[PDB]
Amino acid sequence: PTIFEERHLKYISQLGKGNFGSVELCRYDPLGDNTGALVAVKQLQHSGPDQQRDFQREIQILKALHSDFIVKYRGVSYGPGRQSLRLVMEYLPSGCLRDFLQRHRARLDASRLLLYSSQICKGMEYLGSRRCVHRALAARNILVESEAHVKIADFGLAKLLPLDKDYYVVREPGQSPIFWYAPESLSDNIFSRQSDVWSFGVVLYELFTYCDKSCSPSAEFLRMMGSERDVPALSRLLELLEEGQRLPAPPACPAEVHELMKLCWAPSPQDRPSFSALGPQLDMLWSGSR
Ligand SMILES: CN(C)C(=O)/C(C#N)=C\c1ccc(-c2nc3cnc4[nH]ccc4c3n2C2CCCCC2)o1
Ligand SMILES: NC(=O)Nc1ccccc1
C-alpha cells in the first residue's frame, strides 16, 4: 500500500517550491478515470548527492512519525531513469496556517490561536521524543486540517540527533529565513531541540499577529534596526539579539503568551524551556480560554 506506481500519479498543480525541490498536488488514479484520491507529492530539482541523501533521510523520518499533529506519510514512488524518488503525503486543501490566519483573522479569536499553539507544541514534543530537530518550523509550513486542527509539515531540513549528542552542526547555509533562527544557529550553525524552541517562539509571534505583513518579523527588524539603512541584515540582527532586543508583544497577545515567547528566546539554549515544559502552560491557557 505504500508504493505508488509513478504512471498512476497525475500532476495537477504546484503547492510549494524551494531551492532543490517542489511539492505538487497529484491525483493517484490507478483506474485512469480521474476518480482517485488526491495526494501531495515531493520531488527534487537541481539536486546533487547531498540533496538526494537528505531527501532519503526526510522520507525515513516522516514515515516513522504517527502524530495527529504531523502531516501524514502515505508512501513513495519511483519512476524509470534516475533522480526518480517521490515522497507521497496527505493533501490538506485548507493550506498553510500563514495564509489561513491572514484570510480569516477577523473571526479567529485568542482561544483558537491558543488551540493551534498547543497542537503545534504537542507535535514538537512528539518530535523531541524521537530526537528529531525540525529546523524549518514556521506558519508557512504548518497546515490546516480543519479550522480547529493543525499539523506540522515541511520536513525538508529535519534531522535526527545521534543517540549520544544533543545538537548538530552544518556547513554554512546559503539561504536561511534569518528571522526564525536561534542566535547559535545563525552564528555557529548549531541546531538542536532548543533552537527549535526559539523558532516556536517566532511561530507564537506569527500566530498572535495573524501573520500581518505590517508587523512581520522583517517589518519589525526594519523598524528596530535604527536609522542606519545599508547594514547587512544578518550582521545587524545578531547585534540586536545580543543586546537583548526581541520582537514586541502584539497588542492583542495575552501577557502570559508573550512571557512564553520571551522564555523561548532566552540567549542560552539551556535556559529555554523544553516543549515538555511549554505544553502544560499552553494547555492551561487554552483550557482557561474556552
Ligand atoms: C506562496 N505561499 C503563499 C506559500 O507558499 C505559503 C505561505 N505562506 C504556503 C503554502 C501554500 C500552499 C501550501 C501547502 N498546501 C499543502 C497541502 N497539503 C500538503 N501536504 C504536504 C504539504 C502540503 C501543502 N503545502 C506546503 C507544501 C510545501 C511544504 C509546506 C506545506 O503551503
Ligand atoms: N526572536 C526575536 O525576537 N527575533 C527578532 C528580533 C528582532 C527583529 C526580528 C526578529
CATH class of this structure's domain 1-92: alpha beta
Ligand number nearest to the C-alpha of 200:
2
State the distance from the centre of ligand 1 to the C-alpha of 154, rounded, in angstroms: 8
Method: X-ray
Positions of E strands within the chain: 9-17, 21-28, 37-44, 73-78, 85-90, 132-133, 142-146, 149-152, 159-160, 167-169, 190-192
Phi, psi of 126 (to 5 degrees): -60, -50
Q: Please, are residues 194 and 264 in contact by the beta-carbon 8 Å criterion?
A: no
Length of the chain equals 290
Ligand number nearest to the C-alpha of 155:
1
**How distant, in Å, are the alpha carbons of 3, 60, 138, 214 from that of 255?**
49, 40, 22, 21
Q: Please, are residues 138 and 180 in contact by the beta-carbon 8 Å criterion?
A: yes
Residue 104 carries which side chain, given as an amino acid letter? H
Q: Atom 2, ligand 2: which residue's CA is nearest? A: 246
- Using the 8-state DSSP alphabet, how is residue 276 labeled? H
Q: Which atom of ligand 1 is nearest to the CA of 96?
A: 32
- Using the 8-state DSSP alphabet, how is residue 136 labeled? -
Q: Atom 15, ligand 1: which residue's CA is nearest? A: 95
Cα(73)–Cα(40) distance, rounded to whole angstroms?
A: 10
Q: Which atom of ligand 1 is nearest to the CA of 18?
A: 28
Residues flanking ligand 1, CB < 6 Å: 15-16, 23, 40, 71, 89-92, 95-96, 98-99, 140-141, 143, 153-154
Which of 166, 165, 171, 139 minimizes the C-alpha distance to 154?
A: 139
Residue 109 carries which side chain, given as an amino acid letter? D
Phi, psi of 226 (to 5 degrees): 105, -175
Which of 288, 103, 273, 128 minimizes the C-alpha distance to 204?
A: 273
Angle 167-172-176 (CA atoms, 0-180°, nearest 5)?
A: 90
CATH architecture of the domain 93-290 equals: Orthogonal Bundle (1.10)
State the distance from the centre of ligand 2 to the C-alpha of 138, rounded, in angstroms: 14
Q: Please, are residues 157 and 129 in contact by the beta-carbon 8 Å criterion?
A: no
- All cell numbers assigned to 168: 548538530
Coil/strand/helix, residue 64: helix
Q: Where along the chain do its domains lie?
A: 1-92, 93-290
- Paired with 75 in beta bridges are 88
Coil/strand/helix, residue 192: strand
**How distant, in Å, are the alpha carbons of 61, 101, 105, 181, 268 from that of 140?**
20, 10, 15, 15, 27
Cα(69)–Cα(197) distance, rounded to whole angstroms?
A: 16
**How distant, in Å, are the alpha carbons of 41, 91, 156, 226 from that of 74?**
10, 10, 16, 48
State the distance from the centre of ligand 2 to the C-alpha of 127, rounded, in angstroms: 24
State the distance from the centre of ligand 2 to the C-alpha of 217, rounded, in angstroms: 6
State the distance from the centre of ligand 1 to the C-alpha of 14, rounded, in angstroms: 9
Coil/strand/helix, residue 26: strand
Residue 110's contacts (CB-CB under 8 Å, 6 or more residues apart) are 208, 252, 254, 289
